[PDB]
From Swiss-Prot, chain B:
Residues of the full protein shown: 8 to 316 of 540
Chain's gene name: RIPK2
Family under the similarity heading: Belongs to the protein kinase superfamily. TKL Ser/Thr protein kinase family.
Keyword terms, alphabetized: Acetylation, Adaptive immunity, Apoptosis, ATP-binding, Cell membrane, Cytoplasm, Endoplasmic reticulum, Immunity, Innate immunity, Isopeptide bond, Kinase, Membrane, Nucleotide-binding, Phosphoprotein, Serine/threonine-protein kinase, Transferase, Ubl conjugation
GO molecular function, one term: protein serine/threonine kinase activity
Organism: Homo sapiens (Human)
Recorded catalytic activity of this chain's protein: L-seryl-[protein] + ATP = O-phospho-L-seryl-[protein] + ADP + H(+); L-threonyl-[protein] + ATP = O-phospho-L-threonyl-[protein] + ADP + H(+); L-tyrosyl-[protein] + ATP = O-phospho-L-tyrosyl-[protein] + ADP + H(+)
Domain notes: Contains an N-terminal kinase domain and a C-terminal caspase activation and recruitment domain (CARD) that mediates the recruitment of CARD-containing proteins.
EC number: 2.7.11.1, 2.7.10.2
Name of the protein: Receptor-interacting serine/threonine-protein kinase 2
Modification sites for (Microbial infection) O-acetylthreonine: T135, T159
Region (Helix alphaC): 51-59
Segments forming domain Protein kinase: 11-256
Positions bearing the Glycyl lysine isopeptide (Lys-Gly) (interchain with G-Cter in ubiquitin) cross-link: K171
Length: 287, 278
């Protein structure tokens, strides 16, 4: 049973982000004395959707899912309270390059591994949970840069488009609950992580992107996009191309991706992951 | 809402980790989720395990050992939790050849996190009382963050060294925490000079406590006077003089604010490396 958190116990409320998913602000819990974050939106249908997401996080708890701490549900305030993620989202880590000039490969591969473990867990639930809104903005990073998947506003029990498979452009119950949506998002996320590039950066119009994706086009695979020094480069390219395959049948399960990723992740010495985080903090601090 | 049920056959590569009164702990790999897990496994016995699993399910929080599911089958009963790669606080404090210098910032962060954890339990509506805190039950994750474990005798409101004398209670946990704090700052066994646990109970019953002097707590300990005050109030003979965990957090917060985030990570790497070299 999910705790209910009185709105007045959230002190020093301060805004962080606003998106389609909702508004996110930080706070400190007056009794637990920890930093928390809270996604908040009057209405009546809107309050049901917020409650819908909160129940889903409560149920989907796992080591790589954003931990829900409670719902603030009062006439003055509706909102989901979660642990506060001090290192923001994967999107700023990838694309704020003046702030993070170097993101070592061991950390990037660990992030990819942990995303896959999170989504795999969702897909292994009774009944399977489908996220359907994976994006780098929705992968949050905790104090030591471990993954927490966020934003379940579009999850379902079994530039905003760049992660969406083409068969979902015009949604029908032929894919409405397809098990192959998330892996396609993950393939694009994987390309984004290994390249530190905006997918389809060269296309000014997002409707042009959908038309091109509908025809089978994808973010470029070459040495400029995916540099030669990517560890296990050819294996990662395979993983990307099969994950975003035009034919949904032809895309793997997250289990099979994990089976392939495990020996790759074992080639990095464990301390190397911490080395990578320390390098991020030390250079950032010096700036 | 509903705690998962984990079929025993999904636990691959079971291996022994430790044995205690709480039960036997084994490590494993979950076949479908592809993560390492730990499992505490054994009719009255079946009721207690389910009670503990239910309490962990309900007491979830950032410094509480995360429960992943229950194994409840005719051949196997056991609680499945995340795997803690760095063992317990007890090993970190007392394995002095393997861990020669345990950075002060990290020890204070551990104390802060235990207090945040127990503070949460006491604020739960209704409050949860742990009643078996000990350094053996403070587990350490991959970056040495605290996860409090072993809720087998927690209650809704050497195994004796953490027990207040009136127990031979709403002030139990704070007394255990005071001894834990003394242990963390001294890296000494409480009542080190004592062959028999009945000697401890007799001396604690008389108001005696682990020694506080230059040998146990050297003068160069950071914030020595503040910590000693916190310890002595926490194990006070009269339970009414023991503070709440809120007050412990009030004492610790300004101490933890003096440390840079990089120093914690350096201390963590130093500890990770020392384990591997052993
Ligand atoms: O864009 C920038 N900064 C980002 C920096 C920090 C951000 C964070 C968001 C969240 C978060 N969101 C959240 C998701 C959620 N999903 C379901 S319920 C729920 C409740 C939540 F609060 N949850 C926990 N910690 C954090 S940190 C986004 C803005 C500029 C500065 C570079
Ligand atoms: O003792 C020795 N070494 C230790 C090194 C590593 C150990 C670990 C234990 C646990 C653990 N236990 C656990 C508690 C629990 N509480 C409620 S349910 C539940 C389920 C659990 F699995 N949980 C997760 N990770 C780990 S790592 C203990 C032995 C050497 C000296 C002889």
């Amino acid at each position: 049973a999910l705790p209910t958190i009185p709105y007045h116990k959230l002190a020093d409320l301060r805004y962080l982000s606003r998106g389609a998913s909702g508004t996110v602000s930080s706070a400190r819990h007056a009794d637990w004395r920890v930093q928390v974050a809270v996604k908040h939106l009057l209405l009546d249908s809107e309050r049901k959707d917020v409650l819908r997401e909160a129940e889903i996080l409560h149920k989907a708890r796992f080591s790589y899912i954003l931990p829900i701490l409670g719902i603030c549900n009062e006439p003055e305030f509706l909102g989901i309270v979660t642990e506060y993620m001090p290192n923001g989202s994967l999107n700023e880590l990838l694309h704020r390059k003046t702030e993070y000039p170097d993101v070592a490969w061991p950390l990037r591969f660990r992030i990819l591994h942990e995303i896959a473990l999170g989504v795999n867990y969702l897909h292994n639930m009774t009944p399977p949970l489908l996220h359907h809104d994976l994006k780098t903005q929705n992968i949050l990073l905790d104090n030591e840069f471990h993954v927490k998947i966020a934003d379940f506003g579009l999850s379902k029990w079994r530039g905003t488009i760049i992660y969406m498979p083409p068969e979902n452009y015009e949604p029908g119950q032929k894919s409405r609950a397809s098990i192959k949506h998330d892996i396609y998002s993950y393939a694009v996320i994987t390309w984004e992580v290994l390249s530190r590039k905006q997918p389809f950066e060269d296309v000014t119009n997002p409707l042009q992107i959908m038309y091109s994706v509908s025809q089978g086009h994808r973010p470029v695979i070459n040495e400029e996009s995916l540099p030669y020094d990517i560890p296990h480069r050819a294996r990662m390219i395979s993983l990307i191309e099969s994950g975003w395959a035009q034919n949904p049948d032809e895309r793997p399960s997250f289990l099979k991706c994990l089976i392939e990723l495990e020996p790759v992740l074992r080639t990095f010495e464990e301390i190397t992951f911490l080395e990578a985080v320390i390098q991020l903090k030390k250079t950032k601090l010096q700036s």
